Design a binder for this molecule. Structure first.
Ligand SMILES: CCCCCCCCCCO[C@@H]1O[C@H](CO)[C@@H](O[C@H]2O[C@H](CO)[C@@H](O)[C@H](O)[C@H]2O)[C@H](O)[C@H]1O
Ligand SMILES: CCCCCCCCCCO[C@@H]1O[C@H](CO)[C@@H](O[C@H]2O[C@H](CO)[C@@H](O)[C@H](O)[C@H]2O)[C@H](O)[C@H]1O
Ligand SMILES: CCCCCCCCCCO[C@@H]1O[C@H](CO)[C@@H](O[C@H]2O[C@H](CO)[C@@H](O)[C@H](O)[C@H]2O)[C@H](O)[C@H]1O
Ligand SMILES: COc1ccc(NNc2ccc(CO[C@H](C(=O)O)[C@H](N)C(=O)O)cc2)cc1
Ligand SMILES: COc1ccc(NNc2ccc(CO[C@H](C(=O)O)[C@H](N)C(=O)O)cc2)cc1
Ligand SMILES: COc1ccc(NNc2ccc(CO[C@H](C(=O)O)[C@H](N)C(=O)O)cc2)cc1
Ligand code: NA
Ligand code: NA
Ligand code: NA
Ligand code: NA
Ligand code: NA
Ligand code: NA
Ligand code: NA
Ligand code: NA
Ligand code: NA
Lengths: 423, 424, 423
């Protein structure tokens, strides 16, 4: 009887009520009760979306790569990769600026020497690039590996179209049947995404409630200042980077935000961009009128290697650690931070646990090593205390950047349905 | 020269001859030879049947969920879950009764104090229920996890039907092509099931022979009384619970048993219900006239969370252990046993080794802890010595209960083909 | 920009140039540079080929087993298995002959006792044969298990054909749709194989260069004789065994080598028969005109259980070790070597790491045990020092034998397209 209420209002109600409920439950210490009785519903929501992530990616990208020329696909790839790199660098820049504004970690007052102990190397860029090419596509499917599925789906769709243009009719009909199987699978997946969005408000409520209950009490003092800095920086990344980039390429930013709100809230509460990918793709298709041959390629790739929010978070935490141990970063050191954050977002393409590897890389780049028992590790552990509070906002901005780049590239390729943007 | 012989006679001959052969070979101690030369054929049979389980489940259920309304699907689910819980409770009750009748373990005479230190714990019910929803369906397919595949296949079939009732023709044609792929796969699977049933007598013979050769000598003394008890209870669970439930809803029980015979014997010799699933569904379709939209959903669900024979076995062994260590169970304790056995069938939905987790849970419910070196662990090992002899019958009764509940629900939903139930 | 150059000549140029480049770089000690900068390209080639192996096998075999009668399928299986066993025995015989000819290991002069302790075990024939039948075909697909996928695809194709000959129309149309899906998948796979053969020269160059640079310096002294022996034997296995078997059944051997050159060079540089399988199947179809219902079954089966080159290598290395420790093999011992080499080719059907298992098995068959610190283990390590130089030729001859047997069985079943064999 509740399905009749509109979904977007229900999701916003769940968000607001879960935030307030979690704060109130953590203020009275019932956070364990929230983890035991309320959290499983949000976990169910996240499982329902993660269920859809792999089939929708495989099928939608086979279809899209079929419904597009290889030259256009490569041009779109170059465009979207340039967008991703530029926006990530801008996110690190905004993170450093907002950190210097908030003066994060200035009152932690830890003593640190000039000692330096050599650590291990980051995972090889070459091996990750080779790992883009799978050695068993069924295996990469079972393992949830996005980038190799992207590669295989693109190759499969291109082969299918080249087969549909043959003289023999049996070959054409076989390729047509195969493409129909993928299209029916994709349609079913998007249908199910729409179905799951009906339960989405409950999961939104439960997830925001659990996070607020477990980490609301920790947002005081310097960690509170960190939270304020990170969220301000994210806000700027949307309102300056994304809005100016959308106006430069002629897209109404407010309509963009209104359409993306669903993927935004899903990413904010699930804190997993790849797990928001189904809602993100459904917003790209059935809200913004982006063609499948664009978003079916850019959105998984973007969920994997485009995290503006993570880059801004890294800029803030590196300023925090440097100011907390008492060695503020020189200008050239912050330039190294930006360069290393972008190159490390690239180099960490699809590995698990990439957040901490990237953060360790950025810290090591300026000579802040995570030796155990050292003040640097201490400040890093301080930051990790509010990691979920930060993860919400950073994942939201990651998905929002994915969508903005998708829309910009689609507008530049005239693959954007303008009829969705006129009132 | 082989295929021309009738199949039912061949499987029955293989069962009986393998039982006698295994008994005779194990009584004279050549059981190792049976393990080396005879068992691999039964192993081949089990592998051939296990091979089909995942494709046939996925395809049959996508097809069935497509060819049915979501409201009817929900009604069937509620019906079959009520049937399953009621029959499991009835099985624990029958196990307790037959155990009290045979006075199992009364002459083991072990000394036991009243000390108990907690060892096991239940796997969280919430996490088990959440694990039903997969997070990667390709992975769940690869790992053989039935319940998440069931969930994904139902969601996919419903989406396919909702797409076929759309206005655009391209969407209809894509959804129909997909449903045809799944239907062709399922048809191929059932074809292969029929083909493998030709080799079934050899594997049946080998399996019953190996089990009889390895565990025939052990059916003496108190364990003998256990076997005689357990099988009796299993028999009663078939003859009273199933037959009365079938006559209540207007199903001739003898026709039901005659049709289920193939799945019954397969479950009895392979001792894995999910591994019997292909024969069970092929019997449900091509023998009992159950609609795919019913059995394609109930039979795997029943193989996973409906084990009447295992519940009756638990009822028997709890009385056995309590009588062996010298502490017979109170009436209220037996009621708690029934309640916890039913709740534990749910709580172990799809976990590996669920038999022992459920048994440990039921024992702990009445305060019998399996600390090593204690007399309770000793009696439990006594019981585990004949686990295969018991596993045959209990798995058979698990599969038979699945089939009976499926036919009952199909009769109540007018989804049952009456033309298959008329004799000439 | 170089794509316009013909492909086969480019593959030959890459082979020769990589051999020379690797030799030159390894003699001057720059092998690390080759491993760091050159090898990743050959690795990319090998991963690209490995990607296709599972889909092409599954789909091509479903199609072929569908498009053939079960009686003919069984006849073809018997024929190709007899061919495989005969050629493996012949290869062991040639290996023993060329080893005794080159007097391999005669000048190592190691002292050896008479101790014999068993190392690894053979997997029980019963358990391996049972393992041929999968218990989850999705699992075998994900794990790359070739033999169970072969079994499942054959059973599925036979079921599909039996369904297409039914009276109900829904059954016919469903099975027909499924077979269309598998046919489209296989067609797409062969298309992509052809596409990857465009990058094949780069990978050929890189692989041969890396191998020659890392193990070129080691081909001196007694090991040099081993190389001289092994390749000689390999050469003989091609020019006597295969040529006589092709001439007996009326196939011009030179045309066969000309058509097979692609799979030959791919096997030689990638050293993986299953990884050459796509090129091998494409050569069987679009060069030799072998029907899918033949090669789609014999070629994966041959890559798995037909290794003439490996058998010849075993024949050479057992004589090498026996002469190195000072106990040359009696006539009955060499007969035991041949028998056990064939029986071990059968018994290790599909196990991982079978290369070392088979060699340890044959050595144990003649009483040469790999106890650590023993001289037998020492000679085995000597051979493993040049195992890669040997592996190139070994895989090449394994794949060539696969193709030769496929063409012979196809000629005997009148499933061979003669129009490709006219000058
Ligand atoms: C584990 C148990 C979880 C319980 C969750 C309950 C599932 C929700 C019940 C179904 O609700 C409907 O599902 C449709 C699915 O199609 C949605 O249509 C959506 O999808 C279609 C897109 O083609 C369009 O009808 C609409 O744009 C779009 O609202 C529609 O909103 C919604 O009312
Ligand atoms: C390790 C090697 C294993 C070899 C397995 C042995 C194969 C035996 C030869 C074929 O035997 C027939 O195979 C058919 C299927 O292939 C079956 O059709 C059956 O299956 C159909 C299912 O659609 C039914 O409709 C038919 O009525 C029914 O005859 C049939 O019963 C069976 O006699
Ligand atoms: C830095 C270098 C990187 C290079 C990567 C770029 C890949 C471009 C591939 C171009 O090569 C063509 O690919 C076609 C397949 O895509 C082949 O068609 C072939 O494939 C069909 C198979 O269906 C056959 O029937 C046809 O006869 C046959 O022309 C064709 O032979 C081949 O020339
Ligand atoms: C402890 O929680 C975990 C832990 C591990 C995983 N698996 N893989 C993975 C890999 C990388 C990330 C970084 O991405 C963003 C961020 O964290 O900065 C944010 N989450 C986003 O999705 O955009 C995130 C996850 C998932 C959740
Ligand atoms: C000993 O071999 C095995 C093989 C697999 C496992 N893991 N999963 C599992 C889960 C539940 C059961 C209970 O089901 C019956 C029983 O045993 O009571 C009987 N098997 C049947 O299929 O109906 C049995 C197994 C454990 C042991
Ligand atoms: C690097 O390549 C490989 C390839 C496969 C694996 N896995 N298991 C396996 C399987 C087979 C072999 C036989 O080996 C042949 C030889 O050497 O005579 C030659 N390599 C060949 O493929 O025909 C050896 C091993 C590991 C590495
Ligand atoms: Na970016
Ligand atoms: Na993620
Ligand atoms: Na992202
Ligand atoms: Na029950
Ligand atoms: Na089971
Ligand atoms: Na059952
Ligand atoms: Na051979
Ligand atoms: Na390999
Ligand atoms: Na081979």
């Amino acid at each position: 009887r509740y399905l009749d209420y509109p979904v977007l209002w229900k999701i916003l109600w769940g968000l607001v009520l879960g935030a307030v409920f979690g704060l109130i439950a953590g203020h009275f210490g019932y956070a364990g009760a929230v983890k035991t009785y309320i959290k499983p519903f949000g976990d169910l929501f996240v499982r329902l979306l993660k269920m859809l992530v792999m089939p929708i990616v495989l099928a939608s990208l086979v279809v899209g790569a079929a419904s597009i020329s290889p030259a256009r696909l490569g041009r779109v790839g170059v465009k979207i990769v340039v967008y991703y790199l530029a926006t990530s660098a801008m996110a690190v820049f905004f993170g450093l600026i907002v950190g210097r504004l908030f003066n994060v970690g200035a009152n932690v007052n830890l003593g640190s020497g000039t000692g330096k102990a050599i650590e291990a190397q980051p995972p090889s860029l070459v091996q990750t690039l080779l790992n883009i090419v799978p050695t068993n596509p069924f295996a990469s499917l079972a393992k949830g590996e996005v980038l190799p599925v992207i590669f295989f789906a693109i190759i499969l769709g291109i082969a299918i179209t080249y087969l549909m243009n043959r003289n023999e009719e049996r070959v054409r009909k076989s390729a047509e049947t195969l493409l129909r199987v993928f299209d029916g699978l994709a349609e079913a997946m998007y249908l199910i995404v729409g179905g799951v969005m009906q339960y989405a408000p409950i999961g939104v409520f439960a997830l925001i409630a659990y996070v607020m209950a477990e980490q609301g009490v920790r947002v005081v003092g310097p960690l509170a200042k960190v939270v304020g800095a990170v969220y301000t920086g994210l806000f700027l990344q949307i309102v300056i980077t994304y809005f100016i980039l959308l106006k430069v390429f002629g897209i109404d930013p407010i309509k963009f935000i209104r359409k993306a709100k669903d993927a935004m809230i899903t990413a904010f509460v699930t804190r997993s961009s790849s797990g928001t990918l189904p809602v993100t793709m459904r917003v790209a298709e059935e809200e913004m009128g982006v063609d499948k041959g664009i978003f079916s390629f850019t959105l998984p790739l973007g969920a994997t290697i485009n995290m503006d929010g993570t880059a801004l978070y890294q800029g803030v935490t590196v300023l925090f650690v440097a100011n907390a141990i008492g060695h503020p970063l020189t200008l050239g050191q912050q330039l190294v931070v930006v360069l290393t954050a972008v190159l490390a977002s690239i180099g960490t393409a699809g590995v698990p646990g990439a957040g901490a590897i990237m953060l360790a890389m950025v810290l090591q780049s300026v000579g802040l090593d995570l030796t155990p028992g050292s003040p640097v590790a201490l400040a890093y552990a301080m930051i990790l205390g509010i990691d979920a509070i930060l993860d919400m906002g950073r994942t939201m901005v990651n998905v929002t950047g994915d969508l903005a780049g998708t829309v910009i590239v689609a507008k530049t390729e005239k693959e954007l349905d303008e009829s969705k943007w006129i009132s």
